[PDB]
Write a protein that binds this DNA or RNA. Structure first.
Ligand SMILES: [Ca+2]
Length: 138
DNA sequence: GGTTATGAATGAAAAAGC
DNA sequence: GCTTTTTCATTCATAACC
C-alpha cells in the first residue's frame, strides 16, 4: 500500500460514470466501456468538463498537503518521417472506423501496416496520442 | 523542443492451475 | 467449472528519454 498517484479529471469522470455506461451497454466488456467513457468525456461541454478539472485540482492540492515529500516517479533522419507516417495512417483509421475503432478493425489495421507498427503497444499509443491531440483542438 | 513511457480506477476477459 | 492472478481499454499529467 504505497502512496498512490492522484486522479486526473478523467479518472474522476470514469469513477462516476463507469457503472452507468455498463448499465446502458451490458453486452460490452469493461475495456469497451473505457472506450465509451472517453467518447463521453470528449462530448462534454466546457461547462461540465471544467467541473471535473476543478475537482481534480482539489485532489492534487489535498494530495500534496497530505504527502508533502512525495515525488512523481516512474535511422535518425527517417525517424521524423516515420512518426509523421504513423500519425497519417492512424488518421485514416479514424476516418474509416471511427475514433474508437473495434479491436478487430484495430488488429486488422496493424497487420495491414505491420512494417510501420512493429508491435501492438506502438499502435495503441499512436491511437491514443493522435486521438487526444485532435480532441484538444476542438 | 519533441517523443516515449508510466500510473493513476475500474472490471470483464484472459491466463494459470487446479 | 472454480478461484486467483494478470491483461488492458480509456485521458491526463509528466518525468524520463531522444
Ligand atoms: Ca485451462
Amino acid at each position: 500500500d504505497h502512496i498512490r498517484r492522484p486522479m486526473n479529471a478523467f479518472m474522476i469522470f470514469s469513477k462516476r460514470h463507469r457503472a452507468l455506461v455498463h448499465q446502458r451497454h451490458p453486452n460490452q466488456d469493461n475495456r469497451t466501456v473505457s472506450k465509451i467513457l472517453g467518447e463521453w468525456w470528449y462530448a462534454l461541454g466546457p461547462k461540465e468538463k471544467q467541473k471535473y478539472h476543478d475537482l481534480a485540482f482539489q485532489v492534487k492540492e489535498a494530495h500534496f498537503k497530505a504527502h508533502p515529500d512525495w515525488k512523481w516517479c516512474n535511422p535518425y533522419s527517417s525517424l521524423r518521417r516515420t512518426l509523421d507516417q504513423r500519425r497519417a495512417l492512424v488518421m485514416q483509421l479514424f476516418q474509416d472506423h471511427g475514433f474508437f475503432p473495434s479491436a478487430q478493425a484495430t488488429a486488422a489495421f496493424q497487420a495491414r501496416y505491420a512494417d510501420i507498427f512493429p508491435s501492438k503497444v506502438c499502435l495503441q499509443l499512436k491511437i491514443r496520442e493522435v486521438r487526444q491531440k485532435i480532441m484538444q483542438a476542438a
